[PDB]
Design a protein around this motif. Sequence first.
Motif, PDB file in Angstrom:
ATOM      1  N   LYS A 134      44.347 -39.597  46.977  1.00  0.00           N
ATOM      2  CA  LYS A 134      44.582 -38.173  47.156  1.00  0.00           C
ATOM      3  C   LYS A 134      44.358 -37.774  48.615  1.00  0.00           C
ATOM      4  O   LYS A 134      45.092 -36.936  49.142  1.00  0.00           O
ATOM      5  CB  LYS A 134      43.714 -37.366  46.187  1.00  0.00           C
TER       6      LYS A 134
ATOM      7  N   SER B  87      44.855 -47.266  41.727  1.00  0.00           N
ATOM      8  CA  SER B  87      44.398 -45.967  41.270  1.00  0.00           C
ATOM      9  C   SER B  87      42.872 -45.959  41.219  1.00  0.00           C
ATOM     10  O   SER B  87      42.250 -47.019  41.157  1.00  0.00           O
ATOM     11  CB  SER B  87      44.996 -45.640  39.925  1.00  0.00           C
ATOM     12  N   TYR B  88      42.287 -44.753  41.244  1.00  0.00           N
ATOM     13  CA  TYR B  88      40.843 -44.578  41.291  1.00  0.00           C
ATOM     14  C   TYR B  88      40.377 -43.730  40.113  1.00  0.00           C
ATOM     15  O   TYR B  88      41.035 -42.764  39.737  1.00  0.00           O
ATOM     16  CB  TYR B  88      40.446 -43.928  42.624  1.00  0.00           C
ATOM     17  N   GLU B  89      39.209 -44.086  39.571  1.00  0.00           N
ATOM     18  CA  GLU B  89      38.483 -43.229  38.648  1.00  0.00           C
ATOM     19  C   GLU B  89      37.942 -42.026  39.420  1.00  0.00           C
ATOM     20  O   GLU B  89      37.892 -42.039  40.653  1.00  0.00           O
ATOM     21  CB  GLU B  89      37.366 -44.023  37.967  1.00  0.00           C
ATOM     22  N   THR B  90      37.569 -40.971  38.687  1.00  0.00           N
ATOM     23  CA  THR B  90      37.082 -39.751  39.309  1.00  0.00           C
ATOM     24  C   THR B  90      35.789 -39.310  38.636  1.00  0.00           C
ATOM     25  O   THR B  90      35.424 -39.799  37.569  1.00  0.00           O
ATOM     26  CB  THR B  90      38.141 -38.651  39.239  1.00  0.00           C
TER      27      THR B  90
ATOM     28  N   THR C 222      39.258 -39.216  46.268  1.00  0.00           N
ATOM     29  CA  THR C 222      39.788 -40.567  46.163  1.00  0.00           C
ATOM     30  C   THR C 222      40.660 -40.858  47.383  1.00  0.00           C
ATOM     31  O   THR C 222      41.309 -39.955  47.914  1.00  0.00           O
ATOM     32  CB  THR C 222      40.586 -40.745  44.871  1.00  0.00           C
TER      33      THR C 222
ATOM     34  N   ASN D  25      33.766 -43.346  43.349  1.00  0.00           N
ATOM     35  CA  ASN D  25      35.146 -43.437  42.904  1.00  0.00           C
ATOM     36  C   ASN D  25      35.826 -44.659  43.525  1.00  0.00           C
ATOM     37  O   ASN D  25      36.643 -45.317  42.881  1.00  0.00           O
ATOM     38  CB  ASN D  25      35.930 -42.176  43.246  1.00  0.00           C
TER      39      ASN D  25
ATOM     40  N   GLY E   7      36.853 -34.311  40.368  1.00  0.00           N
ATOM     41  CA  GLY E   7      38.247 -34.645  40.124  1.00  0.00           C
ATOM     42  C   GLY E   7      38.820 -35.514  41.241  1.00  0.00           C
ATOM     43  O   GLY E   7      38.077 -36.069  42.047  1.00  0.00           O
ATOM     44  N   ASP E   8      40.154 -35.572  41.310  1.00  0.00           N
ATOM     45  CA  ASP E   8      40.834 -36.626  42.047  1.00  0.00           C
ATOM     46  C   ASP E   8      40.878 -36.346  43.550  1.00  0.00           C
ATOM     47  O   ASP E   8      41.352 -37.196  44.299  1.00  0.00           O
ATOM     48  CB  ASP E   8      42.236 -36.870  41.513  1.00  0.00           C
TER      49      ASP E   8
END
Lengths: 484, 493
Positions: free
Chosen positions: B451, B437-440, B448, B244, B444-445
């Motif tokens: 988060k 922002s980060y891909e997951t 990252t 991520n 899920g998030d």
Amino acid sequence: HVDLTNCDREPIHIPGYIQPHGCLIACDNAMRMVLRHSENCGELLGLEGDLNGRTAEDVLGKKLVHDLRNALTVRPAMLPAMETDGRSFDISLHRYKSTTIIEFEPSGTARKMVDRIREADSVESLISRTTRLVKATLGYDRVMIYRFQEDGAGKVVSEAKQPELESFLGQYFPASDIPQQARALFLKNTLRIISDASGTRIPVLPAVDVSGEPLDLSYAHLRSVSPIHCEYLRNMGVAASMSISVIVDGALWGLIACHHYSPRVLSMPVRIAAEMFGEFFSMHLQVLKQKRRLDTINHAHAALDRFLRLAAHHANIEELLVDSFQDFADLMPCDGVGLWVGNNWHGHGATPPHDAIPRLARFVASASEGRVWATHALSQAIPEAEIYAGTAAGMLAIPLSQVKSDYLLFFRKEIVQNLNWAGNPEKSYETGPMGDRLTPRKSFAIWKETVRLQAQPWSEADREIAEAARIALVEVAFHHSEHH
Amino acid sequence: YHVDLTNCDREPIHIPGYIQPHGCLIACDNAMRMVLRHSENCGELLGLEGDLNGRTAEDVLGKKLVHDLRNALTVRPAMLPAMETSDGRSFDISLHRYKSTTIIEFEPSGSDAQPLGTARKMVDRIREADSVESLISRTTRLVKATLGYDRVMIYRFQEDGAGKVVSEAKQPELESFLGQYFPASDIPQQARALFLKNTLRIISDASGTRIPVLPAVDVSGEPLDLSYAHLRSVSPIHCEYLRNMGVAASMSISVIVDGALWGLIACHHYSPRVLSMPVRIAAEMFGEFFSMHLQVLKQKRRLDTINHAHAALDRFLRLAAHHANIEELLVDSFQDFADLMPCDGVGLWVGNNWHGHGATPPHDAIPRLARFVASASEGRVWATHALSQAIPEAEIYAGTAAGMLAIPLSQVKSDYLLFFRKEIVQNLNWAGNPEKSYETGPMGDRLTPRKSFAIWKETVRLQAQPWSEADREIAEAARIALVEVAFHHSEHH
Ligand SMILES: *C/C=C1/C(=C/C2=NC(=C\c3[nH]c(/C=C4/NC(=O)C(C=C)=C4C)c(C)c3CCC(=O)O)/C(CCC(=O)O)=C2C)NC(=O)[C@H]1C
Ligand SMILES: *C/C=C1/C(=C/C2=NC(=C\c3[nH]c(/C=C4/NC(=O)C(C=C)=C4C)c(C)c3CCC(=O)O)/C(CCC(=O)O)=C2C)NC(=O)[C@H]1C
Ligand SMILES: [Cl-]
Ligand SMILES: [Cl-]
């Protein structure tokens, strides 16, 4: 000429000679030209004629001069088993006072030694085992450790020896036995090597150059030895030595002294190991010493906290202190303790007599500014204190009030009374021209005279503990005043 | 069994049953007589034909190599660069015994300098640092320059186990994490245990195909404990986290201070990456030196701070001795006490009158605070970094003051010198990009940095920086100095 009248200022850094177990060449700062050489260079290195005024390249050859110049970019550089004619020499190289000094000797010890001390978990255990380890590993007839005292005297705190030798354990030598210049050179150099106390010195040619400058051999391992020390060693029967300097808090804590009763010099590889061992020893000692100090301070804080809690439920604090004061002796090393409150004396252990206390209390009241006052030489402060010096030669005083001359007093005996000397009072020494001054027996006697009527000094740690106690007692007094 | 966010706190990461593909692994009995297990890639990597399990070590590796390895086991896993194998080739070998199993790990040898020389060059560039700050700042730059990773960070663990990013060197195009924190839960307890036991943790490829250890479970039902194996494979959870971020590879150097994990030097690469064993040996040596130097600098700084406090309090004592009115002196002087320890505010509460300096609770809030301390203290220093937890009403002013250290001035009156600290979030110095922002992945998030940081912020909401043992020692010194001022005053007046 050095003698007992001027040996305190002997210029031992510029003797003009080396020891015979190596040879020495001095070049200019750029290692271009040979400026001086020991007389034995010809024999050792296979060179003919006066080497002075030959180029370094001429004398050493292109390869060696190149290699040494490279080493000089990188403490003296230690280069074991360098190739000259195809022979092998251990070379030490350094620059000082704009002079390059090259020293030559014909050609996992450290890890093994360090592994045998790294688990020591007290200063006592470290110093005890080190003499035994060093003796076995380096093969000297005796190994001692000296700890320097506050006045610069040395105490023999550890010893491993051949069974037939006399013991020096627990003995002290006066500060004067090691002149200030020797101390400077033991701070600057990890190792001091003496291969032969009766070896004929080799002159550095020239001793004094055309500009009138001596050759400063401060960092040269081949530097010759004072005739004073050579005579001292000869009187002992010692023929060779090597010391490893012990550094704590950036200063000289003491020495590991290795003595041999026949000539001896360790090869450069082994000396390098010994130096590495010495560095580890110093660091491990420092760490153990720090831990011991921490534990002692924490012990005092814990005790004083118990006292504070105890006092909180006592209506009569004077009474509590009359009942309790003896326990305060456990806060720091002492031979006696006492309470002087409202002109009444309560003593425990070795103290001055009842009738002596007024004078002491009066003196502290005059000399103190309301903090701890302490001396290890009572008779110097109070002449009449001499009579009871045997019992109490040192006093530390904790004030219990700024308006009243009330004190908690700690005492120590004359230091000679606490001696634990393992040596033989019957053992005698031959002497040379300088006489009996240069013998362990006379050294010890001189030390005893330097500390007559004196006790062990109150250390910085002792004084911290005393201050902790002072403030704890202030708090006791204050909280009592708050209530009641 | 499958690891997920509900059970990753207890994932048995020591027994994954796989290794990473940048080396191969052979497991023998404790005497190195027989081969019990092997990674599937041993055949390809070492050039061995046939099932390895059941064969003697001498058969598989040759008598010479086994003899040498046995010798090394007599004299931490042993790290043996450039060992000659039976076919003439050179392999870097890691060898250790654990749980009565000998584990041999192999990587193809490259061309390397002696570890000691590499380490000495690095150590020479930090050994002259004379503050913790200077050491910590320079080390990420040096390590990045020496090792060639895209990012090098240092984390310092907080009292609650959270990590703070206290140093960073990075490629110019990367986002910054400097001044960020991650919650304790981002590194599970077993991962912490394995960062205490192993100086280095290497991940060559966060998306690399895992190589099975054959057999995963032996005849007796036992998995292979790879706690000390450098090739041990990586938790899917962390692999997902790394992916991520865009991180493909890492190496951490554990920092040990006072026998425990102070933090990590974390090296991250955005492409698959692994260091040669000789350079890894150098990194380990550097890490040991770094730890020792940090400890020495940390001790000096503490000593300087305590001595600074004693000197200041001694000046105050001498000052007070010539003052008839000590309350007045304190009213005029109390602000200076803020210089004794890190704080955002200080105040004097004496005779139901308040005087404040810096960031403090409002005037009206102080009586409740003093009453609370009075009921909670046995007459020594009292301190919290979570005021609202002690006093719900304190939540309203948590931004200004979330932590309080109270020094009692009397055993018969609720008079105090109070120190305050703001909510920790208020004192952030984050160099990061809030819009990054980060891909997951499937989990899920949670996995990252964005988060992680948000979770940390929640864990410390309404809380300040904890009062340290040094802070508490300084406060105690101040307490007893003030007792002394009062006592000497009473003695003379
Ligand atoms: C006025 C000069 C004096 C003097 C000079 C030097 N002493 C040096 C080293 C040294 N001397 C001792 C003395 C001891 N006293 C003892 O009681 C005792 C043993 C029981 C000894 C050995 C010690 C301890 C040392 C340190 C080295 C070691 O222990 O081996 C010295 C340096 C020589 C050099 O290395 O160049 C000089 C110069 N010694 C005196 O006694 C006075 C008169
Ligand atoms: C419930 C399990 C979780 C989990 C497991 C593991 N994490 C491991 C290592 C690790 N994870 C982080 C997390 C970070 N949080 C950040 O905000 C951030 C960067 C800005 C990072 C990288 C860190 C810091 C570390 C330490 C290593 C490093 O920094 O490179 C781990 C060990 C893997 C291994 O080596 O085998 C496991 C297992 N991670 C989670 O997030 C929770 C859910
Ligand atoms: Cl002279
Ligand atoms: Cl000591």
